[PDB]
Amino acid sequence: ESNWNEIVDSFDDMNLSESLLRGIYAYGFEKPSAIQQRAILPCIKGYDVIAQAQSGTGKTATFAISILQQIELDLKATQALVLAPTRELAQQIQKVVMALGDYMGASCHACIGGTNVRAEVQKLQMEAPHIIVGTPGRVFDMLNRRYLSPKYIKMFVLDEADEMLSRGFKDQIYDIFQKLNSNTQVVLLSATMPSDVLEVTKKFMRDPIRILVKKEELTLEGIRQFYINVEREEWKLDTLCDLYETLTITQAVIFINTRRKVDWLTEKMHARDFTVSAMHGDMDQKERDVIMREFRSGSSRVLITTDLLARGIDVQQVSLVINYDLPTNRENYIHRIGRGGRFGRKGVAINMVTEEDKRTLRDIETFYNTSIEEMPLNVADLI
Amino acid sequence: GSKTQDLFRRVRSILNKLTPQMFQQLMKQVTQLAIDTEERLKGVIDLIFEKAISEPNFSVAYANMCRCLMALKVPTTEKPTVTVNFRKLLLNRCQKEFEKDKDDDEVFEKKQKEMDEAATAEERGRLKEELEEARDIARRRSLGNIKFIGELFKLKMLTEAIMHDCVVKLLKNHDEESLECLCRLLTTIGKDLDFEKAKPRMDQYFNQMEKIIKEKKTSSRIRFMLQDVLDLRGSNWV
RNA sequence: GGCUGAAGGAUGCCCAGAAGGUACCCCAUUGUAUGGGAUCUGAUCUGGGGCCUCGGUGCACAUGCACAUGUGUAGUCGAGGUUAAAAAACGUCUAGGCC
Ligand SMILES: [Mg+2]
Ligand SMILES: [Mg+2]
Ligand SMILES: [Mg+2]
């Protein structure tokens, strides 16, 4: 829930600056998430806020809006600190702030380890960015040598404190707070609500305002799931061809549990006029990101994946998921569909189920408590 | 009878497979389709138009696909001594989709009474969700139709005059949906429309919405898209 | 009862005219809206358009003797004229024509 009882409809009423609105709309934000709905106004006014929500789902975006609103544009200095559990997520959050501040004229930086110290000294001397992200240990190692200004900083921010507690830098943040001022705004957010973070609340942040965002993954009834009674493995590809011949497919996600079938079906489809992008279990993470973004853009209309890889990264702008082979991990089924974010407003699931896997269909239907209707012959109008 | 349905199946398969990169390899398949009856032609055009306005991202490819069938004559079933070119039929669908706005609010009005008739809170909320969902389905259509028309323009199946009387028609209806469509159309046709033969007329279009930009009477998001369009114009449409 | 195809229609192009549009301009009300005008158009209809004259090449013929000249022209390339218009020899239907 939220002890603060102002739940807002959209960004329009949030009384943002026009240039910040231009940045956020150029990014693409239309309707706030729960933390965006509620936890934005408290940090605009200047209150000190504790928050708990899912990471990467716009949770950082809320305080991005708030901080960039509070930042004074005229003064070229560092007015706020941000402390991330790692360095690469700090780079991502700096980039996403740039996505919401390209029209601001402000500046953000990402102080990260494994870098030349005097290079950072000169970069801070030439121009102090209005905000800085980083990790508590190297952030303190950077600040203590007076390479920044711990004076003008008026909003201290912790993100993923549970992860910082895992690193065991409680004394490190203790000293970082001891260095900064007294009456500055403080916001801390965490993935969960453990006892250590709650202890951190009463030590540094005064009069907490609590944001308790409820993570959810069950939207079973929103999305429809049909099955096709194809019994021969060789006829599975013909079944897929029929599906593409009788459906209005925008983009499709092909799930395959194993590895050999992935390349087998990839080559079979590439013989036909399809354009596909395929991911394997022996792949790296970088080229996986390349393939994921390539499919996201739309230059390819088929994404062949394996369940764990789709769990690692997902895109919900797809209107059709073919469960080509039902997963041995029954629970992973909900991950395979991906219903965790109401993605199935109009989304459909297709299970090309071999004969002996009708039993598998049965226990997923019962245990998950769903209803897998049979593929109608006249579904072209229903979808 | 089965021939028409089989042709529809193959056409929909081609449309689903159609992508900008793999374009050429499928085009042979398109030219090898036996479209020789007004019903088959009308159905194929219906499929193409529905796909192209319901999925703007790939519309480019579909637009170019239409160019491959700009000359496909067929005899009308009523009077078999007459012929209908594919272009005449595809454009009529586009124009009919373009001017539904005059009637569009009407159907919403025909449902607006139901908003009053849904007495209880549950019924009222469900009716409101359905009417806004319908409003989304329509706004998504109009935008797709506008982008498709703009894409057909770049392939010269249209001419500058139709764009110049479509932009002005969108702009005269100062409602939000029309201004969004205007932003989309100019964004997709600016480079191929910003010529010296149209320099005076164009010089008013943007100026007009500049007043809109300065009025701030509409929703912010509309102003924001109009600012994007104007800035893209300032940078020679790139 | 099956094969094929007329620049005879239809389609495309060009020209004329009409419905419709017309940001800007002008005129009226006068309210920034409607109506009219002026261009600019015309996703749509109604008509019209398959001209001449000269060369090159090729072809056939007829003469003289493989070669040359004359004649006609291949949906020929050009070069010019003429009418407001000089067209996709046409992802089409027929009248036929044949078995
Ligand atoms: Mg008129
Ligand atoms: Mg005519
Ligand atoms: Mg005639």
Residue numbers in the entry:
A (entry chain A): 24 to 406
B (entry chain B): 754 to 991
The authors write:
The IRES from encephalomyocarditis virus (EMCV) interacts with eukaryotic translation initiation factor 4 G (eIF4G), recruiting the ribosomal subunit for translation. Within the EMCV IRES, the region G680-C787, designated as J-K-St in this study, is responsible for the specific capture of the eIF4GHEAT1. We previously determined the structure of this J-K-St region by solution NMR spectroscopy. It is composed of two stem-loops (J and K domains) bifurcating from a base stem (St domain). At the three-way junction, a highly conserved sequence of six adenosines forms a short stem loop, termed ASL, which interacts with the J, K, and St domains at the junctional part.
Here, we analyze the three-dimensional structure of the J-K-St/eIF4GHEAT1/eIF4A ternary complex by using cryo-electron microscopy (cryo-EM). We analyzed the structure of the J-K-St/eIF4GHEAT1/eIF4A complex in the presence of Mg2+ at a 3.8 Å resolution by cryo-EM. In the structure, the J and St domains directly contact eIF4GHEAT1, while eIF4A does not interact with the J-K-St region. While the cryo-EM map in the region of J-K-St/eIF4GHEAT1 was well resolved, the region of eIF4A exhibited a weaker EM density, especially at the N-terminal lobe, reflecting the flexibility of the subunit. Based on the cryo-EM and previous NMR structure analyses, the angle between the J and St stem domains in the J-K-St/eIF4GHEAT1/eIF4A complex is notably altered compared to the angle formed in the free-state, whereas the structures of the eIF4GHEAT1/eIF4A themselves still resembled the free-state structures. The structure exhibits two distinct binding sites on the J-K-St region. Each interacts with two separated negatively charged clefts and the surrounding positively charged patches on eIF4GHEAT1, respectively, via the extruded nucleobases A724 from the J domain and G777 from the St domain. Importantly, in the structure analyzed in the free state, these nucleobases are not flipped out but stacked within the stems, while both are flipped out in the ternary complex structure. Furthermore, the relative orientation of the J and St domains is quite different from that in the free state. Considering that two Mg2+ ions bind to base triples that include the ASL domain bases in the cryo-EM structure of the complex, these results suggest that the excited conformation of the ASL domain without Mg2+ is similar to the conformation of the ASL domain bound to Mg2+ in the complex structure, preforming the Mg2+ binding sites, which are further stabilized upon Mg2+ binding.
